[PDB]
């Protein structure tokens, strides 16, 4: 092992080195080294090949430095911290001051007093009694349904307050009475309560912080707070006054308390330190959290938890509260204990323990001690207390209290313990009222952090806009800040005045675990089974003998807590004080001042009231042009950046020239509505992600996990591993040179093709699992190209190929981690059985080795292992699918609230992006500052050009250009992001996105920075993380917990292999179903039916629940309207794009990009939400308890499901409007019409019913009702943004071409550019979006495609014809698309259009018809017991049922199978129905047009079939063709003569009709008929051929697609 272990063996041989060779080994230094020493030293424990002897000496090594590591103590300041709280009578106070001003001789008292806080609790009452008001008036608006009889209590109660302002006290035991009243109400209702008063007050909080930021403060003082409260609500005089009297009252009483103490011990002594003169206080990291603590808070007469750490760290010493006295002395207790001849029952209990300490305060101040009060106390007690009292009032004042130790170990901080023997038993637990440190421990630093994150989670709440307010979490005290807990105690608080905590004893403990667990091996003293040991508390006891724990001789000297002024004596003893609360009637809210809770319109009828005579003459008119914008811009469901940048910078410019205050308020109101209406409008991400891996990293396992886990979270999941191999040349490259300064090129060589090869062949049989040279993705002139080509080898390079390859279109996740999926909330579920939340993110590895893997775990229980293997792993994890982005398109991971590059999330395909382009510019422009400074040529003229034209040169002040400067001439050879942290000052590019993006958006761009100083979330910093890194297991997200808030697990609808509809077959189900639909609707009373069936879906997979919910989002009907606009033409683009393979203009296939995308991602939300019980109420199916939800319970909106489909039932304005995706909507008066009509139009039908899943199924318990409790969570559900389909009808480019009026000439013909894009002009590449200039014209080509079907869609005129030709001759076909014979472009008269029209509908239902036939003959033709080999050869076509269309085929496949089966009616019925008119017609002279010409056209289509002369495709066409014929045979041949063909026969069929009926219809059959009788025409057969010869081979479309060319060809 020597060998093995050779490299740690040197690496511990330098750090003794080091160690030896410290100037002082008492600093953080020296423990980081011998910390390093024990962990290296378990490492070789971890080795398996260990002898006893090496134990035993290891042992011994580990004990010397433990020892070495304990003895490096320090020893705390003499200073004793106690924060003031305001309201507290200053006599009391003093006493236990007094005394640990005299038992701690050597020592500094500080009284840490904030006068600027004084009138704070009158300020957070008043914000509260706000945000209780909002929260009760929206919960009544939200449940018209009922009444809650507590809001009217409420009410009334204010409203009897209202008029007698004297009886406080009245009020607040009304207020009691009226909480007992409110326990009552439902759990619902309450558990909405909780999370509005939580959401308000937050709200609230950032208001006035907004209000801090306009006014440009730097220090938040009383009187800030009293303008701001006259800013939000109207202060009367006497309001005004009790504010100050406070700030009076309070000054008085800490000067006085201060007086009377120095008078007695000196001003030096004790001394009054300003909390305001902290630095954390200020810190920008803190978020001041400090002041939202004055809010957040549930235990007002304790002091702050956030002043207590920022004392410690800023000042060491002993933090104390003020409530205690020092431990007793040992000599106190013996004769504490010799008075009770053996009773030990007086040091354990409550009621006896402070009743002694009450008496021996009184004795050390001198006061009397018979006055002690022993109420609750026996008179045998009381007088044994009275005798023992008097037994310790002999001894001196010195001698009655101990002292504590004052050298604590480095970097640790001691914490009180406390015993309380209840009468259920003990209660031992920790308590941050008596603490110890030094000035700058790290243990201080990480319990900050802590709180800080604790306030992030909390904030969670109202940050995440994804927040699910209805998910019970079970009380498990988990470490997270349960929001509807914390909601219940401050509404119980609020109520009656009268447990959990974010920031207190349990978090500290919690945080004081984990650092000492991250430090390593030196921690076991302090840790215990998971659980900080008696080691890192003070005033720990010992039990001897029995459980009694031994009183007399501490382990460590600890502080006496039970104390008359103990926590437990101000709930009855000293009555709630009433300057803590100041009665407000909130009816009078000024709601124009608050952006944050209420969206407010820009009207110009009182926008301008309160503004001065000057700046409305001046900027009204300015402003009033804005109004239009600017509600469109709030109004609309997408964000359009170059309105949003225009207004936004034209707001900022009227803000900079004006010189009002309250006008600049209602400004900087209008940019916060900005803000918050980008910071809500998320868009969807696409489910890829790409992992930038180290080629030469040793490790494999990880990536082949994460790419196992991104593959099982989701088989939609794309995976991509961008690697560079000009990257790794260079990188070989330079080593060598190095080593050259200071033949292994075959090794390397051979290492990284094998490892390359390694990953992709372990990953071969998947096709999503891509790997991808980035040398050859990007392009030439980029910039990632150069320098890849000037060998640039900084470590940087990974992270700017990210960028690069955004901006090159590959989107999703870019990651250079090996980042796996989040746990999902079962898996959590699954593992909380037996383990807590401090083992389960450890056992988290194992358990997804054995998801991702077969590995099993002899550490993990069997119980959990065959839970884990019932659920698919797709239950268990988390896909990229379902995350959302910011608007502006770019998200990042966070660490502590600061954003990073770890995982560069960019938003979708389609969606706009300015971060990427500002990206793209910025990395441009330090290429350049890069490769001008490598020559060392820069100066600052230089600079001002390599930064002109770019928003990048805002970054360039007098002291980046020094600094840039001075970095030149020092090295001249910097990497990117050192010279992008020189020219800024940022760490990240990421940091600069927000600063580049600010010179767009001016104002808006800085409001957003600024937040981020008042807690509020970067914008560029995603919050929901569903990623874990493999190495600690924790989330990436800003405010997350991937083990107490992971995400429900979302379910897949798997669906069969086979499709019943194709694209090209789908719009059979919607045409022979639409008429019994309308018929069924019409028939239950309905009066308004619309037909708008989708086109986007034809496989049911998801059960079509994005179009569900989008048409769910819904609550107009003029939205409605646009809606069904937008997806009407989306389907039909879907159709010309994909099933016409027909290229779309690059503006309308970023429309259906973007619409893909969001319907992707609202089937995933859809079908996660409605499988989450707590989120949605689910019942079976039942008409009169849906119509009981929809008219008692006030259902607005529901989900119906069936096994396959989604309809969707609304109540728009007074109708209720059912909705299926497939067949439009129809509406009714009432509910139980709908129902009905629903239940009818599922069942009768039998193939409507088979295909939605409920063929001989019973559907009254397979149909499922998905409702929200308020409608208003759909508002939480449903989002925002959803690219405008449902405000804006968006355009296509034919309608925007449309729309001009002016002609092109081309080719010495003037046609509108609408008809010429319609030919499919194409210019360069692409088509044409715009007219071309005369330049263009000799450029412009034709598709052959488009060309075709437009040709195939339009009956032109001749003259129109001639210029297509012209057009044709003169500018030719596009190479590579369908030659277009000119011959076949001609025109019809006027008199033959309508036929002709007619004649091309036939062809589409035909092929529409003929498609779907082939597959189920395809289909029929894959059921065959065949033994491979590919020659079914069918030998005998024969038809047995006339009526049901049964042909007997005999195959001979080699084994003679016979399937004498196959049901094609389509075939037959055609040619029964043409033989039954022909035969009956002089009778019956109906004339079906459309019949003769379907018919005419298959008997042309299989006559060129026959001409043209086997796989199991081709073979299913060819007898597809011969059931043709053999239909025709059977109906058309009167006689079996031998002498006929089915061309001459339909021919004399039709031209008889014609004979018959004459007329312009005649004439266009006997055309037909006479089309049919002479040969195929040249044109027609070469265009058959060529198209059979190269086009169909050329192209890679299925059968079916060819088959419908080969349709249309013969239609034509």
Known sequence: LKTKYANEIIEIKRIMGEYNLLPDKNSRNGLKLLQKQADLLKIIMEDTSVTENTFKNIEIAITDIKREYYSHTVDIEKNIHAIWVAGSPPESISDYIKTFLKTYKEFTYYLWVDEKAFGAAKFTSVLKQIAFDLACRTIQQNTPQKNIDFINLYNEIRKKYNNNPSGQQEYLNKLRELYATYQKISTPLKHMFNSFFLENMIKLQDNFFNYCIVKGVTEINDELRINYLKNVIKLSDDDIGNYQKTINDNKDRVKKLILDLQKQFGENRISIKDVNSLTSLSKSENNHNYQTEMLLRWNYPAASDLLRMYILKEHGGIYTDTDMMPAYSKQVIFKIMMQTNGDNRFLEDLKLRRAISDGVLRYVNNQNIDEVNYNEISDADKNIIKKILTEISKMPEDSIFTKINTRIPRDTMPILRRYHLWPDGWNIRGLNGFMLSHKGSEVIDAVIAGQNQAYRELRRIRDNIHSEIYFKQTDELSSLPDTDKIGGILVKKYLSGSTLQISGPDLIQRKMLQFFRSRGVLGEEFINERKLSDKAYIGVYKTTGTGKYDWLTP?????????????????????????????????????????????????????????????????????????????????????????????????????????????????????????????????????????????????????????????????????????????????????????????????????????????????????????????????????????????????????????????????????????????????????????????????????????????????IPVEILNKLSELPPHELLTPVLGQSVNPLGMGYSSDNGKITEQVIVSGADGFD?????????????????????????????????????????????????????????????????????????????????????????????????????????????????????????????????????????????????????????????????????????????????????????????????????????????????????????????????????????????????????????????????????????????????????????????????????????????????????????????????????????????????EYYGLLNKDINKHIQVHYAESDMVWNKLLPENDAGLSTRIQHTTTDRLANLAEPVAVAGISLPVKTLYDIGATLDGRRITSPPTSEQIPSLRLNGDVLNDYLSRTVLTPEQADNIRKILHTQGIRSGTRPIDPEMIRGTQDDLVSSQTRLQRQATRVKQQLAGVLDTLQQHFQNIPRSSGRHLSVENIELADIGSGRFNLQIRDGETLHTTSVEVPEVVSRFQKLSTMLSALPASGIMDFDLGMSVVGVVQYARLLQQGHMDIKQLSEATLGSMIQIAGNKFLNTEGIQGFRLESAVAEGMRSVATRTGGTM???????????????????????????????????????????????????
């Open 913 to 1249: 992006n300015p971060i990427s382009g500002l990206i793209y510019t910025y990395l441009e422009d330090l290429y350049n500052i890069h490769v001008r400074m490598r020559e060392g040529t820069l100066n600052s003229q230089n600079l001002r050009q390599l930064l002109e034209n770019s928003v990048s040169s805002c970054f360039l002040t007098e002291q980046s250009i020094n600094k840039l400067l001075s970095e030149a001439e020092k090295r001249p050879y910097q990497s990117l992001t050192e010279i992008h942290q020189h020219l800024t000052g940022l760490p990240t590019i990421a940091d600069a996105t927000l600063s580049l993006l600010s010179v767009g958006l001016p104002g808006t761009g800085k409001l957003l920075r600024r937040e981020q100083d008042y807690g509020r979330p970067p914008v560029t910093a995603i919050q929901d993380s569903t990623f874990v890194l493999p190495y600690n297991f924790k989330g990436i997200g800003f405010n997350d917990n991937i083990i107490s808030s992971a995400p429900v697990a979302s379910s897949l609808h798997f669906i069969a292999e086979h499709a019943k509809y194709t694209l090209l077959s789908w719009p059979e189900f919607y045409r022979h179903h639409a008429q019994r639909w309308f018929e069924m609707a019409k028939g239950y009373g309905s009066q308004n039916i619309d037909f708008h069936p989708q086109s986007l879906l034809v496989t049911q997979e998801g059960r079509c629940m994005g179009l569900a919910l989008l048409y769910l989002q819904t609550e107009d009907t003029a939205h409605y309207s646009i809606l069904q606009e937008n997806l009407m033409t989306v389907s039909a683009l879907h159709q010309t794009s994909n099933r016409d393979k027909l290229p779309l203009s690059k503006d309308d296939n970023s429309l259906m990009t973007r619409t893909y995308s969001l319907i992707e991602m609202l089937q995933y939300q859809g079908n996660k939400y409605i499988t989450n019980e707590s989120l949605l109420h689910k019942t079976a199916w039942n008409q009169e308890r849906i119509t009981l939800l929809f008219n008692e319970k006030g259902v607005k909106r529901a989900l119906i499901s069936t096994p396959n489909h989604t309809l969707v039932l609304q109540q728009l304005e007074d109708i209720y409007r059912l909705t299926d995706p497939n067949f439009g909507h129809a509406d009714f008066l009432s509910p139980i019409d709908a129902l009905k009509f629903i239940e009818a139009m599922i069942q009768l039908t039998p193939t409507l019913q």
């Open 555 to 859: 382990e460590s000297i600890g502080v006496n807590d039970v104390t008359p002024a103990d926590e437990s004596t101000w709930c009855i003893g000293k009555g709630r004080c009433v300057d803590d609360f100041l009665f407000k009637d909130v009816s009078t809210l000024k709601t124009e001042n608050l952006p944050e809770l209420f969206l407010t319109k820009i009207d110009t009828d009182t926008f301008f009231s309160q503004w001065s005579t000057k700046t409305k003459k001046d900027l009204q008119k300015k402003i009033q042009d804005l109004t239009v914008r600017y509600n469109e811009l709030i109004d609309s469901s997408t964000i359009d950046f170059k309105n949003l940048y225009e207004i936004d910078q034209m707001l900022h410019m009227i803000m900079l020239e004006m010189n009002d205050d309250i006008a600049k308020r209602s400004l900087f109101s209008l940019q916060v509505q900005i803000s918050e209406k980008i910071r809500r409008m998320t868009i969807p991400v696409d489910n890829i992600i790409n992992i930038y891996p180290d080629l030469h990293k040793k490790n494999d396992n990880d990536l082949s996990m994460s790419i196992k886990g991104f593959l099982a979270s989701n088989p939609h999941t794309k995976i991509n591993i961008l690697y560079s191999n000009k990257t790794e040349h260079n990188i070989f490259i330079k080593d060598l040179f190095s080593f050259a300064v200071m033949a292994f090129f075959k090794k390397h060589n051979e290492n990284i093709h094998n490892k390359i090869q390694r990953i992709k062949d372990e990953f071969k049989e998947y096709s999503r699992v891509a790997i991808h040279n980035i040398d050859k993705v990007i392009f030439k002139g980029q910039t990632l190209d150069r320098l890849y080509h000037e060998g640039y080898v900084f470590s940087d390079i990974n992270t700017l190929s990210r960028y690069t390859l955004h901006g090159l279109g590959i989107t999703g996740v870019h990651t250079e981690e090996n980042l796996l999926p989040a746990p999902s909330s079962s898996l959590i579920n699954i593992l909380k059985e037996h383990y807590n939340e401090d083992e389960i993110s450890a056992k988290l590895p194992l358990a997804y080795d054995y998801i991702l893997n077969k590995k099993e775990s002899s550490s």
């Open 1562 to 1612: 005649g004439k266009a059959l006997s055309a037909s008929a006479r089309v049919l009788e002479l040969p195929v025409l040249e044109t027609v057969l070469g265009t058959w051929n060529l198209y059979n010869s190269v086009i169909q081979l050329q192209q890679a479309t299925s059968y079916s697609e060819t088959m419908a060319a080969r349709v249309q060809i013969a239609f034509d």
